[PDB]
Write a protein that binds this ligand. Structure first.
Ligand SMILES: CC(C)CCC[C@@H](C)[C@H]1CC[C@H]2[C@@H]3CC=C4C[C@@H](OC(=O)CCC(=O)O)CC[C@]4(C)[C@H]3CC[C@]12C
Ligand SMILES: CC(C)CCC[C@@H](C)[C@H]1CC[C@H]2[C@@H]3CC=C4C[C@@H](OC(=O)CCC(=O)O)CC[C@]4(C)[C@H]3CC[C@]12C
Ligand SMILES: CC(C)CCC[C@@H](C)[C@H]1CC[C@H]2[C@@H]3CC=C4C[C@@H](OC(=O)CCC(=O)O)CC[C@]4(C)[C@H]3CC[C@]12C
Ligand SMILES: CC(C)CCC[C@@H](C)[C@H]1CC[C@H]2[C@@H]3CC=C4C[C@@H](OC(=O)CCC(=O)O)CC[C@]4(C)[C@H]3CC[C@]12C
Ligand SMILES: CC(C)CCC[C@@H](C)[C@H]1CC[C@H]2[C@@H]3CC=C4C[C@@H](OC(=O)CCC(=O)O)CC[C@]4(C)[C@H]3CC[C@]12C
Ligand SMILES: CC(C)CCC[C@@H](C)[C@H]1CC[C@H]2[C@@H]3CC=C4C[C@@H](OC(=O)CCC(=O)O)CC[C@]4(C)[C@H]3CC[C@]12C
Ligand SMILES: [K+]
Ligand SMILES: [K+]
Ligand SMILES: [K+]
Ligand SMILES: [K+]
Ligand SMILES: [K+]
Lengths: 242, 242
């Protein structure tokens, strides 16, 4: 019946989209990955030959460097670091810069996520609804000064999202030595709750302990962007959900 | 008015929860992080003293090791690797094992996420609704063989979630050299779309190219668990949402 027809039609489209994306990603990244692997292998071979590093100690050095990578940015388990980790956990971002090393800590993190995800989702939904109402009121007032259609609301939301993305990209590029495109990409990744972790803010020269204003601004920007995205999402998707 | 009262009451509870979580995480991880940092610093100092490694070349070695970490697991941009990356992107997991290195690739990934997230969400919601209806029908048939309350449905969903988590943990522990607790934690992280990236499957001895059955089973388990979690989320969260 329809329900099954729609359920099976969605699956086929999703599978086709996944296949197309995988094919494009392979065709675009195979040569680059091969070249990077060749260059890295040549460099490491040259370094090993020059320094006569033993093969057994190479694995130990790799493990030490990998384990000490988060520690090179300072102390990541202070009050600011713990707050950042909790914010990433509740928002399902998963940056991966710092992870618990204790089984009890892992269990506590799991319980924290379980007890916090629905509350954060409900709060974000309420904030998005309130922002949508405020935006509608502002648009009505502006039109009176100068009825509202959906398309106008959709365009206003898209423009607001683009402006927020541009502002965040400029702010993060002018305070962390990042390119405009790289900052925009990082902001988009952060606001979509994906969290690749390739670019992580508040990880340079101990900014988590010496720049409280920057941390506060980053938290405010993250919350504002999440609220903005939660309105565009529920005003284009929730209509077809139920 | 109530609306603002509820909106402001949610915020206070969320902030208190964040503060409590940050305090607990700090009090639980400060000493462990300090000990790990001290041990790593001592080990690296001893290694540098023994091998007489120059300071300038140490940064180059660290950069080479960091850039070559994904490549140590094989080829991550093949058909299987591209499919895995696309699956992680559309599901907003963000493992971070492989990331694009080209600006055009990053733009394509951003467009892919934008065009794929709503479709995946709608498909997951439909699958969860269908599974919920099937579970209700099965429960009614079982009760007839031996009306349904909401508490019974919640208990059945929780039991199904626990069973799926246990099965996935056992399967991933018996095929990737992992402990039961670590496998359970990794499965929980994967199913919540957090994606810390500390534990990533299909990254050992080139399993992405030599074990197609394992990759297919992992994909099926991920999809099933995502549907199961989405169903429970629909039961608990949507009733209080609208
Ligand atoms: C196993 C997992 C999925 C459990 C998830 C727990 C939720 C069912 C709880 C956790 C936080 C709760 C919320 C915390 C705070 C509030 C504000 C509260 O508002 C008021 O008390 C003032 C307004 C009014 O009088 O309704 C209404 C319930 C609500 C949304 C709660 C609804 C139920 C929530 C989402
Ligand atoms: C209404 C729209 C179009 C504009 C919104 C105003 C922005 C232009 C302002 C509002 C908040 C500002 C930010 C608030 C806090 C900071 C931290 C501040 O950092 C420091 O002062 C310490 C580090 C340093 O020395 O750079 C640098 C500027 C910045 C990013 C500000 C940049 C300019 C921002 C984004
Ligand atoms: C209704 C909305 C607008 C409430 C917004 C609340 C903010 C004003 C608060 C909430 C969380 C706070 C942050 C939580 C944690 C920290 C780390 C804290 O760092 C330390 O305590 C160590 C470094 C130092 O000694 O300054 C500095 C303040 C800061 C950035 C706080 C700044 C003020 C913030 C952003
Ligand atoms: C900028 C971003 C937010 C754009 C998001 C795009 C969505 C508005 C699109 C993308 C995929 C679309 C879905 C793709 C497939 C289908 C199945 C389709 O079902 C059928 O064609 C059979 C049943 C029927 O006849 O209705 C109904 C619409 C729907 C849910 C579409 C609804 C609109 C969706 C969610
Ligand atoms: C109804 C519930 C209670 C049980 C569901 C059945 C499971 C016990 C089965 C169903 C799918 C099975 C998996 C399907 C595929 C594989 C890949 C398979 O890998 C290989 O054959 C190649 C690698 C190797 O040589 O180990 C190892 C077993 C495993 C994980 C299977 C383990 C047992 C599973 C989870
Ligand atoms: C309605 C539902 C049940 C549909 C389920 C579809 C699956 C049966 C398909 C969809 C995606 C497929 C996978 C997509 C990609 C790959 C990588 C592919 O690897 C290669 O082509 C290189 C290695 C080799 O030569 O085997 C092996 C098959 C596999 C695991 C496929 C196995 C079969 C899968 C899981
Ligand atoms: K992530
Ligand atoms: K990550
Ligand atoms: K990582
Ligand atoms: K997510
Ligand atoms: K994520």
């Amino acid at each position: 019946k329809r329900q099954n027809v729609r359920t099976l039609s969605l699956i086929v489209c999703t599978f086709t989209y996944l296949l197309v994306g995988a094919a494009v990603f392979d065709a675009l990244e195979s040569d680059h990955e091969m070249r990077e692997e060749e260059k890295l292998k040549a460099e490491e071979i040259r370094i090993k030959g020059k320094y006569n590093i033993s093969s057994e100690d190479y694995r130990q050095l790799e493990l030490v460097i990998l384990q000490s990578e988060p520690h090179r940015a300072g102390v990541q388990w202070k009050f600011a670091g713990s707050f950042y980790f909790a914010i990433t956990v509740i928002t399902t971002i998963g940056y991966g810069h710092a992870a618990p090393g204790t089984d009890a800590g892992k269990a506590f993190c799991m319980f924290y996520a379980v007890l916090g995800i629905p509350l954060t989702l409900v709060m974000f939904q309420s904030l998005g609804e309130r922002m949508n109402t405020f935006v509608r009121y502002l648009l009505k007032r502006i039109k009176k000064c100068c009825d509202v259609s959906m398309e106008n609301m959709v365009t206003v939301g898209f423009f607001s999202c683009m402006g927020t993305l541009c502002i965040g990209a400029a702010a993060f590029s002018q305070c962390e030595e990042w390119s405009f495109f790289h900052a925009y990409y990082y902001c988009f990744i952060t606001l979509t709750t994906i969290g690749f972790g390739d670019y992580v803010a508040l990880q340079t020269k101990g900014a988590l302990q010496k720049k409280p204003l920057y941390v506060a601004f980053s938290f405010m920007y993250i919350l504002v962007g999440l609220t903005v995205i939660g309105a565009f999402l529920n005003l284009v998707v929730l209509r077809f959900l139920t």
